[PDB]
Amino acid sequence: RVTLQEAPGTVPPGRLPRHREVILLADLVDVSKPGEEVEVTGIYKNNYDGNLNAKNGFPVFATIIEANSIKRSWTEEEEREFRKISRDRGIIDKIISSMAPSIYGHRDIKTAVACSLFGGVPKNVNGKHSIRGDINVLLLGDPGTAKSQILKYVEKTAHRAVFATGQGASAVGLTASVRKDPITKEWTLEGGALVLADKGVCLIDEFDKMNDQDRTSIHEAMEQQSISISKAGIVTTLQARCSIIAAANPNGGRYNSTLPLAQNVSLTEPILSRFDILCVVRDLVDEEADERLATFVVDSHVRSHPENARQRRLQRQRKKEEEISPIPQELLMKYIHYART
Amino acid sequence: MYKEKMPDSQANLMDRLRERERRSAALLSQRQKRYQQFLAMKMTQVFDILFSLTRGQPYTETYLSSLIVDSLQDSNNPIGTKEASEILAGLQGILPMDISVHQVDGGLKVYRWNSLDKNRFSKLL
Amino acid sequence: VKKVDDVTGEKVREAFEQFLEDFSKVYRAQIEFMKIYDLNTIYIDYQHLSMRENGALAMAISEQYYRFLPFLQKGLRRVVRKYAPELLNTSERVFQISFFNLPTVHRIRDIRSEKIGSLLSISGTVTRTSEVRPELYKASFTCDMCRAIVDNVEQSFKYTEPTFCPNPSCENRAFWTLNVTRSRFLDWQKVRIQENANEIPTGSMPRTLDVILRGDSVERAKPGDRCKFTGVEIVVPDVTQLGLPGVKPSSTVRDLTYKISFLACHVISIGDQEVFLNSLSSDEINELKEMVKDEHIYDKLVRSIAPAVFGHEAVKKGILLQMLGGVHKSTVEGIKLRGDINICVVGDPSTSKSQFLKYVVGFAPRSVYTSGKASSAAGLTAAVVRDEEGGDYTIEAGALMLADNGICCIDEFDKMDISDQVAIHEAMEQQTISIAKAGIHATLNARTSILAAANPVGGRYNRKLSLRGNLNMTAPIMSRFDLFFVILDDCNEKIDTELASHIVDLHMKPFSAEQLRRYIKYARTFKP
Amino acid sequence: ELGTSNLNLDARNLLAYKQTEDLYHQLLNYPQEVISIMDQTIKDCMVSLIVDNNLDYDLDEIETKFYKVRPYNVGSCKGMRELNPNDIDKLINLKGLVLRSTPVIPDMKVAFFKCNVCDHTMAVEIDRGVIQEPARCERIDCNEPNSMSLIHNRCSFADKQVIKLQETPDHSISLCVYDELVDSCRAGDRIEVTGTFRSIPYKTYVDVVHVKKVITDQDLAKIREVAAREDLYSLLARSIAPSIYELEDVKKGILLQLFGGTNKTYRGDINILLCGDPSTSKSQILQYVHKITPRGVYTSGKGSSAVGLTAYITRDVDTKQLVLESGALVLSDGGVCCIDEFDKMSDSTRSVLHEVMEQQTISIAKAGIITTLNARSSILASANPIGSRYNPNLPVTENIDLPPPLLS
Numbered sequence A: 001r002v003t004l005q006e007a008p009g010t011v012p013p014g015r016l017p018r019h020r021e022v023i024l025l026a027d028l029v030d031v032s033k034p035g036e037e038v039e040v041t042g043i044y045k046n047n048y049d050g051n052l053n054a055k056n057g058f059p060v061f062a063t064i065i066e067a068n069s070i071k072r073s074w075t076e077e078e079e080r081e082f083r084k085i086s087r088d089r090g091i092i093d094k095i096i097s098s099m100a101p102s103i104y105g106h107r108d109i110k111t112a113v114a115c116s117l118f119g120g121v122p123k124n125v126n127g128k129h130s131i132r133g134d135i136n137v138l139l140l141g142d143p144g145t146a147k148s149q150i151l152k153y154v155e156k157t158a159h160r161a162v163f164a165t166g167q168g169a170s171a172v173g174l175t176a177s178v179r180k181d182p183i184t185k186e187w188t189l190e191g192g193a194l195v196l197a198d199k200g201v202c203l204i205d206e207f208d209k210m211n212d213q214d215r216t217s218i219h220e221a222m223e224q225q226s227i228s229i230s231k232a233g234i235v236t237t238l239q240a241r242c243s244i245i246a247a248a249n250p251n252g253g254r255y256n257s258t259l260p261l262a263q264n265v266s267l268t269e270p271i272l273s274r275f276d277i278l279c280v281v282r283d284l285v286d287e288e289a290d291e292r293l294a295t296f297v298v299d300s301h302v303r304s305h306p307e308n309a310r311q312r313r314l315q316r317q318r319k320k321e322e323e324i325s326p327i328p329q330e331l332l333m334k335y336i337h338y339a340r341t
Numbered sequence B: 001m002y003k004e005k006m007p008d009s010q011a012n013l014m015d016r017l018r019e020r021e022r023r024s025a026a027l028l029s030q031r032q033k034r035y036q037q038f039l040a041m042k043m044t045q046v047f048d049i050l051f052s053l054t055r056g057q058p059y060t061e062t063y064l065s066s067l068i069v070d071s072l073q074d075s076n077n078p079i080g081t082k083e084a085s086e087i088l089a090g091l092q093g094i095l096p097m098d099i100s101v102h103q104v105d106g107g108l109k110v111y112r113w114n115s116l117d118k119n120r121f122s123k124l125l
Numbered sequence C: 001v002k003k004v005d006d007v008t009g010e011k012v013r014e015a016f017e018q019f020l021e022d023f024s025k026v027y028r029a030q031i032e033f034m035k036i037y038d039l040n041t042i043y044i045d046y047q048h049l050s051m052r053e054n055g056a057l058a059m060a061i062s063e064q065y066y067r068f069l070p071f072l073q074k075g076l077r078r079v080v081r082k083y084a085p086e087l088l089n090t091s092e093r094v095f096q097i098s099f100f101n102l103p104t105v106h107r108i109r110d111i112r113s114e115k116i117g118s119l120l121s122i123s124g125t126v127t128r129t130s131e132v133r134p135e136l137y138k139a140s141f142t143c144d145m146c147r148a149i150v151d152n153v154e155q156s157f158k159y160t161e162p163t164f165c166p167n168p169s170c171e172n173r174a175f176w177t178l179n180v181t182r183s184r185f186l187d188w189q190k191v192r193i194q195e196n197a198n199e200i201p202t203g204s205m206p207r208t209l210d211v212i213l214r215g216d217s218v219e220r221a222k223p224g225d226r227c228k229f230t231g232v233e234i235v236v237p238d239v240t241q242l243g244l245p246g247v248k249p250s251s252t253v254r255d256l257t258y259k260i261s262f263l264a265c266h267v268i269s270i271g272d273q274e275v276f277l278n279s280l281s282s283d284e285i286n287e288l289k290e291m292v293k294d295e296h297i298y299d300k301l302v303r304s305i306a307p308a309v310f311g312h313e314a315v316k317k318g319i320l321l322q323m324l325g326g327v328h329k330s331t332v333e334g335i336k337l338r339g340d341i342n343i344c345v346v347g348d349p350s351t352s353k354s355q356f357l358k359y360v361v362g363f364a365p366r367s368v369y370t371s372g373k374a375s376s377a378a379g380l381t382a383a384v385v386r387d388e389e390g391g392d393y394t395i396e397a398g399a400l401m402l403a404d405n406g407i408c409c410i411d412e413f414d415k416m417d418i419s420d421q422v423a424i425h426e427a428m429e430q431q432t433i434s435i436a437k438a439g440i441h442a443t444l445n446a447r448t449s450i451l452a453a454a455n456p457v458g459g460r461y462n463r464k465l466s467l468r469g470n471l472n473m474t475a476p477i478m479s480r481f482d483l484f485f486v487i488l489d490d491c492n493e494k495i496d497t498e499l500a501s502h503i504v505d506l507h508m509k510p511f512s513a514e515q516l517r518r519y520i521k522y523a524r525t526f527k528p
Numbered sequence D: 001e002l003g004t005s006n007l008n009l010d011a012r013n014l015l016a017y018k019q020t021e022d023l024y025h026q027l028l029n030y031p032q033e034v035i036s037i038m039d040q041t042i043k044d045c046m047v048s049l050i051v052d053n054n055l056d057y058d059l060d061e062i063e064t065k066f067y068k069v070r071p072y073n074v075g076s077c078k079g080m081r082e083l084n085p086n087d088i089d090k091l092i093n094l095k096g097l098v099l100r101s102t103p104v105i106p107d108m109k110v111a112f113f114k115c116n117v118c119d120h121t122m123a124v125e126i127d128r129g130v131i132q133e134p135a136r137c138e139r140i141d142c143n144e145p146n147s148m149s150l151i152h153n154r155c156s157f158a159d160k161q162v163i164k165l166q167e168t169p170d171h172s173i174s175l176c177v178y179d180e181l182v183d184s185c186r187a188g189d190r191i192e193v194t195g196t197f198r199s200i201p202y203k204t205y206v207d208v209v210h211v212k213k214v215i216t217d218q219d220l221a222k223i224r225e226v227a228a229r230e231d232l233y234s235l236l237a238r239s240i241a242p243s244i245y246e247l248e249d250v251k252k253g254i255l256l257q258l259f260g261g262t263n264k265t266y267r268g269d270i271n272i273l274l275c276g277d278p279s280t281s282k283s284q285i286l287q288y289v290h291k292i293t294p295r296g297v298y299t300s301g302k303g304s305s306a307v308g309l310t311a312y313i314t315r316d317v318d319t320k321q322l323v324l325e326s327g328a329l330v331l332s333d334g335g336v337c338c339i340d341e342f343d344k345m346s347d348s349t350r351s352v353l354h355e356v357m358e359q360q361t362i363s364i365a366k367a368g369i370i371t372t373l374n375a376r377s378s379i380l381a382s383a384n385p386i387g388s389r390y391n392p393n394l395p396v397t398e399n400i401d402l403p404p405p406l407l408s
Ligand SMILES: Nc1ncnc2c1ncn2[C@@H]1O[C@H](COP(=O)(O)OP(=O)(O)O)[C@@H](O)[C@H]1O
Pocket: A102, A103, A104, A105, A106, A142, A143, A144, A145, A146, A147, A148, A149, A150, A247, A293, A297, C337, C338, C429
């Protein structure tokens, strides 16, 4: 018996994730493990008969799916357009400019975001040695620098993204939680946010203000891309192959330009060593830069305001996308998926 | 903006203020009449509450007035508690034949309305 | 052998069929719409039901609804066979009726045993919900001795086996085989709601109740929503009555305990110029229009917030603007722009800063009042608590999730511990609450406007120093308040004389407070 | 004239008249019989005064309905703990304060049985808590035995509620109420009880028959005489506390605090702080006030906490709503509380005093609980000065260890 949960990027706004019980029979066992994404074909049947008719009010049952076949992929029409795009000279600059178009400036951050989205090669050299393939990014700066809304673009762009807040997270919740099976009464383990974000990206906002233990829980995940646990006799390690994007504020809430980085933050050199790219932001004042930023922001707020009709509205939306980005965003998402694949 | 650039009126500005003054009371009276009509029209959408699910007689006016508010009226057009009390008091005057509530010692106790009909008596407005 | 007939029920069914045939035939158009779109449930406006026979039909149906429902169901299915027999086809006559638009709405406070078996409407804030399940509406059984079949075995609130084998040539009883293919099922859901804040007087605790939903109406209830239900009250067996004092009746031995639950058929959540305007009458439109089409309305509304507090006009403007928060925007990139406005006020221990909070919580359609030291991190955002009916966790609404799309008031803000001030930040800027604790990984709506009150670091305003040294709040939290006021006290005689006069008149005793809610309900929809 | 379904009989008239006192002494063991007789007596009296006297004509609903009578001022008994096993089922009178209420619980009155083979329906009612299932269908044709079945939601029930009351005999007792008596008593109600003391095969509980939600002219003459004499203030100060010499201003202030201001809807809860030297008689005054004033609670700031003052609040599985374990500060509702060692109160506890003194309320928002509680009370407090003695070489504000927001 295996539980299938809604994909992290597919949860509807403001609702808890839905899930169903899936029954694997006839040698269809061990086809999947926690963290894997699968598609299954089966029969929608009811089998929860018993005391439920009297324990809860009125006679009711519960539904399960008995699995028949399961599977853990691109047409030529998509690859042709991808290869058409790939031959453009200087494609890197278009891709970098494509990240979060409504955010003005911060190109040195946008490049890091794009690089983390594409990622590298997890070179398992000779098997006996391994290297993490994903880039870790820390966004440190003063308030009013969009260190948070960038994560609200990675969450909407990457194939599988998980977002968490520093004080709204727990060490058990992020890594893994222990459960007792309702049928076999045995100790069982359920993956946390890092296990869910496997082969994806994990987002942690306000990374500085979380308690020290929840911050410590991220140590193994940032380099081993795995979760090691020993609770209630359960000893196992899960895959947590995800990149981490963290946003934080400096000590006192404003960056002291006259002091080093190793003094402006409550973090420590170990934690900083697990990152690759550190983006330091100053909210310094200047008439020209401020005028540029304000005239960009006011037009962004003009655009985002409301105002075969489906086709016409899609055309108008893509027109607005062209007004601000060189690449259509659906094509960018597909391109990122294809490149990672 | 600066639209009032050259309204070069004569001493008739005093007569303009007379126009402002001497008819303001008429507008206030019209606003009061409009509130009266507001109540006299909302009572048409209230008596269904009384008709539907109240046949006993333990209901004091304090209960029914608090039941007109925090009710179907809690909607695109909310209503106030004192407005609900005014509605419930005006129902007796507008329908003498079915409501004869009397002061007990403090406040009013409302009994089971006879309810000959529902809305045909609104013609008196 | 002829069974006993309900002649009143037959008359009711005939009247209901005549109502269906004569009402104008919009409901027959609804039936055709259901046939076109493959719909299971028909919906009936109660005020349409109450406009035939002076509404006596509706009264009779409502006051004994649990009895008369089968007759109306029979009438409707006869009508559908008369006009749309294809809806009886499967791949077998499942059909539901849902009434809405009740005139009266009843509180959890006013639940009585007299209301049992009658149609009524209630409203309450949802706190916990269970997952949807299938319910055995009508079952069928096959005999065990012989192989006869028994259809249409309605399972009234309990698992019910057939009492006899229909063929007299068989003596089967107390043993049956349940069919799971010819039998038909329906959706099931339970909603656990709470009494609203404006119902309970101060010093009184809110009541809780469990509400039952079935059919397609399920999943339309979300936590934190001021939902509204329509249906009938039904009692269900209870096991917690044991140990109570007083004589308990017995059946002969068997137990006969009960507890009260509400079954609702229609679900709606309370909440674009023309849509709103078409729901108001001419006089209502005129009354709302006077408050909009006048030259000085802005100053008039400024001079109307909290009329008991003298002076302090800046905060009166601020609260008025906060109550009409900005339009929320979503970028073509999908990034969302926050629209709600936060306000912080700091004053000396003498200036009336708490009365603004009390006026807001007493006036706002949705509002929650709390104290800085009394509040905690879990009590503001959301609480991770073990759920009933299972071993998994489930959220509970904190101070921020409650009064969503409303104003949240916090007093003694500077007294709050920083570790539980931090959690308010995400709601203050992202309008969301993110949870990654104990099997919950969802992100919740936190569209709330934060209103706070605080005191300087030394209680008194140390007027020797500047604004920088008199506040313990750091830059990150100060940056998130769209408006920020520091009000002071001075020994000016002309001010203190009037202040004394009015604060003494208080102890001696343009637009009314009721009108402001009506105005805001119209104003809030605009998108400049 | 009244459309009411019951009459509150002025049971103090039973003691004001001789034969009714004898009736009380006879009735002490049999209230139910007299109440049942009085129901029919009321119906007959109504019928007579309406039609026999030809004064009214509205009779039908009164004729058909059932009435009750509730005596509300019966003479009190010897006290709850003094009641004997043979005092059970006797009419009793008690007093106290209500704390908690259970939700509305329906109690069976009518049973609706339907025959499951011919749909015939029988009306069955409960007599003395007994359900009698019909053995066979009553129809001449349908004689199938045991075919009668009960439809749960076509039955009729009545409201039953359990209310918790802290009783003070002339300990807590959980009362029982039925019919319109439910939800008439709520948390915090000041209650006098007239009903039946019960213990049945054995928990002690009261079947309430009525509930009350609440001197000589020579005393008036004495009050007027004391008020008229010119030394009224001097005499009052002199007689309040003999062990404390002089201190006219302190006497006047504390007596004024006992008098209290006017309450309008703006309370009059006067609060006084003693900042004298740490050897002046101040504990002797507060300890005496705790005994002379109408009863309150005596507390100390050092020996108190935030939970100790306000309350402990938690949900309940049985009640399905929040319940409170009242603290001293809320227990003093409407009375007077004394707080020694006010300078030693913890900061978290001191934060509670703010909203208490500013709005007479306490708002709490924690995990699963969001509610406000009323704590309207007057606070008399004593606080030693900073150091071993009051030092006039320092400012008066600096001699007190209370922050400006609390001190001002
Ligand atoms: N460089 C920028 N260009 C355009 N808009 C910006 C920029 N920086 C910040 N903003 C605006 O300011 C807000 C910053 O939100 P947030 O990400 O919470 O700030 P931070 O995380 O830096 O404290 C965003 O809503 C965004 O619209």
